[PDB]
Structure 1
Amino acid sequence: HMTEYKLVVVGAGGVGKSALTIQLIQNHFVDEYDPTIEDSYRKQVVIDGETCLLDILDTAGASAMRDQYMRTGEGFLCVFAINNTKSFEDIHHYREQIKRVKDSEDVPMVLVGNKSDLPSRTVDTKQAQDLARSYGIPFIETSAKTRQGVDDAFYTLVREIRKHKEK
């Protein structure tokens, strides 16, 4: 009685992959979550009248688990932090890896700019928009601290997966 959606959260160390994921599952902000825990979580959530069981891999480091989620994951959150220019620059590499594993430029994906609550961003919203536009994907700004944008990011990914394949 539910539809399963397999999601993978990727991006540089420190950007808030775990904090976003924990926020979605537990509705709290974690200051410090072991930066080495790579694991999968499950959330049941009704999105547009469909009961979804999200199977989410929170990636960490560099794994037999990750290989399978990369091959069989249906959508990707590609996360950078708006105060980490290098994490933004790194997106290209995460997107390239995903394209290669899928042999496709048409993979459900959302670009996520995290830590929107922090002052004096170094990556402007227009830089991120430019990048998401060239990739043909949505850009969503989040804060795992305030929860701004968190459900938006995950719901939008679910919708991008549907736009791409029957579920």
Structure 2
Amino acid sequence: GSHMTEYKLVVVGADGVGKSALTIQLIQNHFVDEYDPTIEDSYRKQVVIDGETCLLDILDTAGYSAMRDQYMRTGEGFLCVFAINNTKSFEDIHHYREQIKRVKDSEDVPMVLVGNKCDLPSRTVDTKQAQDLARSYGIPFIETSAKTRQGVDDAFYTLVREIRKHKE
């Protein structure tokens, strides 16, 4: 074990749900207020998760996909993000999950369902409803806010834990 483990994480979900804001909060502890649409960006951070020192490589995606399928197939695990005030983004999750399964050609891909913007009033997606969908996929569910930092570390770390379960 002179080899440091590297985990390739990919963040997916509809446009505007907070994929970039989550990632930038994780890396630089900074909340981005401005909406700046992403094409494809990558980040890297060394962290300790359950006592294991590892390197996270994080691919932040856009919310015409020969190129997209390829960079998706590099991913070991996926954060599937929706915003709790955007019903359509929640409905889109099924489609992200199918896209992941298709490109990985696997029915068992490490994944975490993230409900973001939980600092905002007037949620349209209830906790129970998201919890139940996660249950039907057999994956964890976490409520997050890129603005307050609620759930940020826990979302990425939980996904690493799912990857470790997968590797056995």
Query: TM-score, normalised on structure 1?
Result: 0.94
Structure 2 unaligned runs (5+)? none
1:149 positional shift: 0.2
Contact residue 2 and residue 50 of structure 1 kept, 8 A:
no
Listed one character per residue, the Cα deviations across residues 80-100 of structure 1 (whole Å, up to 9, x for unaligned) are 000000000000100001111
How far did 1:46 drift? 1.0
Deviation at 1:67, TM superposition (A): 3.0
Q: Secondary structure at the match of 1:76?
A: strand
Q: Structure 1: 5+ residue runs without aligned partners?
A: none
Q: CA deviation at 1:63?
A: 5.8
Moved more, 145-154 or 28-37: 28-37
Please say if residues 19 and 33 of structure 1, whose CA atoms lie closer than 8 Å, have aligned partners that are also in contact: no
Question: How far off its partner does 1:2 sit?
Answer: 2.0
Q: How much identity, in percent, do the aligned residues show?
A: 98
Residues 43 and 63 of structure 1, relative CA distance in 2, 3 Å threshold: farther
Cα deviation, 1:96-145, whole Å, max 9, x if unaligned, reads 01111122221100000000000010000011011101100000000000
Aligned CA distance change for structure 1 residues 129 and 73 (closer, same or farther; 3 Å)? same
Give the 3 Å change call, closer, same or farther, for CA 11–62 of structure 1 in structure 2: farther
* Root mean square deviation of aligned Cα: 1.4
| Partners of 1:44 and 1:54 within 8 A in 2 | yes
In the alignment, does 2:132 pair up with 1:138?
A: no
Conserved? CA contact 2:79–2:114, under 8 Å? yes
Secondary structure of 1:43's counterpart equals strand
